[PDB]
Design an enzyme around this catalytic site. Structure first.
Site, mmCIF file in Angstrom:
data_model
loop_
_atom_site.group_PDB
_atom_site.id
_atom_site.type_symbol
_atom_site.label_atom_id
_atom_site.label_comp_id
_atom_site.label_asym_id
_atom_site.label_seq_id
_atom_site.Cartn_x
_atom_site.Cartn_y
_atom_site.Cartn_z
ATOM 1 N N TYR A 112 46.415 38.166 34.045
ATOM 2 C CA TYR A 112 45.369 39.153 33.797
ATOM 3 C C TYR A 112 44.108 38.775 34.572
ATOM 4 C CZ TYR A 112 42.558 42.415 30.990
ATOM 5 O OH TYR A 112 41.747 43.424 30.549
ATOM 6 N N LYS A 122 45.122 49.722 25.191
ATOM 7 C CA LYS A 122 44.308 48.853 26.034
ATOM 8 C C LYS A 122 43.186 48.292 25.190
ATOM 9 C CE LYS A 122 43.433 46.579 29.678
ATOM 10 N NZ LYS A 122 42.915 45.500 28.781
ATOM 11 N N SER A 181 36.629 44.189 25.902
ATOM 12 C CA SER A 181 35.537 43.424 25.328
ATOM 13 C C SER A 181 34.469 43.086 26.368
ATOM 14 C CB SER A 181 36.071 42.120 24.731
ATOM 15 O OG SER A 181 37.119 42.351 23.823
ATOM 16 N N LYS A 185 39.521 49.572 32.816
ATOM 17 C CA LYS A 185 40.628 49.417 33.749
ATOM 18 C C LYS A 185 41.611 50.597 33.679
ATOM 19 C CE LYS A 185 40.697 44.287 33.729
ATOM 20 N NZ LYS A 185 39.393 44.042 33.086
ATOM 21 N N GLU A 211 49.063 49.459 28.891
ATOM 22 C CA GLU A 211 50.201 48.612 28.549
ATOM 23 C C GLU A 211 50.963 49.315 27.437
ATOM 24 O OE1 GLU A 211 48.295 44.840 27.657
ATOM 25 O OE2 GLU A 211 47.126 44.996 29.531
ATOM 26 N N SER A 213 37.214 45.930 29.383
ATOM 27 C CA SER A 213 38.473 46.153 30.091
ATOM 28 C C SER A 213 39.184 47.474 29.801
ATOM 29 C CB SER A 213 39.440 45.022 29.801
ATOM 30 O OG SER A 213 39.038 43.849 30.474
#
Length: 348
Positions: A144, A302, A305, A61, A265, A58
């Protein structure tokens, strides 16, 4: 100088969770520092370096968010566009009332963490979104979701009239100077590509899946990822790329002490361990949470995994510091956060 500080936080991790290898990279005022532990591939015996390729899951992203932001800067789309504006096949569905921005920030109305198993073609993927019944009103909850940010990246590439994987590998990534970052690892670089190791200690790599490229498919090195962080701190010479990166730092809403942007984030810095742990907790990751107004120095992070890998990135632009940690075991998220937070606080 930095070596003992990093070692004190990383070495107990390796021991306790039996992590085969980890590449750690630290940025402090322009200077990149590399710290490499252990083994990338137990079967061949290849060691970890800052050039080893890890799956980052992720963390991908943040790059997808950057590509979407690039589409915005280029005037190909806007965050407040309805999703169906960029996909004729979505006209007449719930996505006539859901925005690109909402998809990017997982707030479209409760798209789930993963596609159902049966969604394994573009035909079934289109059918999945058309069949999907909204759980929440748009913007009211964060859930999420790989289908959510996945569709965002897909439609963003569509707005730029290029398929996602080549747009990423041929425009965005080399634009960031990331030449050893891949959606699909080519033959010449396969020797550099680590294996991940499961709970069973079997060598594994990520399995293809619908919109994997967009949501969790990036392979990269600690060196290339630290370059990305440096671009996020002291930007880039390309002004369109600079604008796109800046878009990804804007806060759209908050959940607790965490603020959701595009990909990244963020938190007020300095930040307690508790607040970082809460923002990166199972409750925030796995459940729907109501959105609040965004937080009014800032730390960005961020986690990422795959079945065999565990990644974390955190940086603080105002202090010019950042850390990248890439391992070939999926070890607990709270361990990643605790180590990174310890290290950054000694840099500050």
């Amino acid at each position: 100088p930095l070596r003992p500080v990093v070692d004190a936080s990383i070495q107990p991790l390796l021991k306790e969770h039996r992590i085969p290898g980890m590449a750690v990279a630290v940025l402090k005022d322009g200077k990149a520092h590399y710290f490499n532990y252990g083994v990338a591939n137990r079967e061949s015996g290849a060691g970890v370096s800052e050039q080893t390729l890890f799956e980052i899951g992720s963390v991908s992203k943040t790059l997808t968010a950057t590509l979407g932001a690039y589409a915005v800067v280029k005037g190909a789309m806007q965050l407040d566009d309805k999703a169906s504006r960029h996909a004729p096949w979505l006209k007449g569905s719930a996505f006539d009332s859901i925005t690109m921005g909402e998809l990017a920030t997982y707030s479209a109305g409760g798209l789930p963490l993963q596609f159902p198993e049966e969604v394994d073609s573009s035909e079934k993927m289109r059918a999945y979104y058309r069949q999907w019944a909204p759980v929440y009103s748009p913007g009211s909850h964060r859930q999420y979701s790989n289908p959510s940010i996945g569709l965002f990246g897909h439609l963003a590439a569509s707005s730029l009239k290029q398929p996602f994987a080549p747009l990423m590998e041929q425009t965005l990534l080399p634009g960031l100077g990331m030449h050893h970052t891949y959606v699909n690892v080519p033959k010449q670089a396969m020797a550099s590509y680590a294996y991940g190791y499961s709970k069973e200690d079997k060598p594994i790599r990520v399995n293809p899946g619908m919109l994997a490229d967009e949501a969790y498919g990036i392979k990269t090195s600690s060196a290339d990822l630290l370059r990305f962080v440096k671009a996020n701190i002291g930007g880039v010479d390309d002004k369109a790329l600079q604008q796109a990166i800046s878009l990804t730092h804007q806060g759209h809403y908050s959940v607790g002490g965490m603020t959701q942007g595009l990909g990244w984030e963020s938190y007020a810095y300095p930040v307690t361990e508790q607040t970082l742990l809460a923002g990166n907790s199972a409750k925030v990751i796995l459940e729907a949470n109501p959105t609040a107004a965004p937080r009014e120095q800032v730390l960005f992070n961020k986690t990422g995994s795959t079945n065999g890998f565990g990644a974390y990135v955190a940086f603080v632009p105002a202090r010019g510091i950042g850390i990248v940690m890439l391992a070939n075991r999926n070890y607990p998220i709270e361990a990643r956060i605790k180590a990174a937070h310890a290290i950054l606080a000694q840099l500050a």
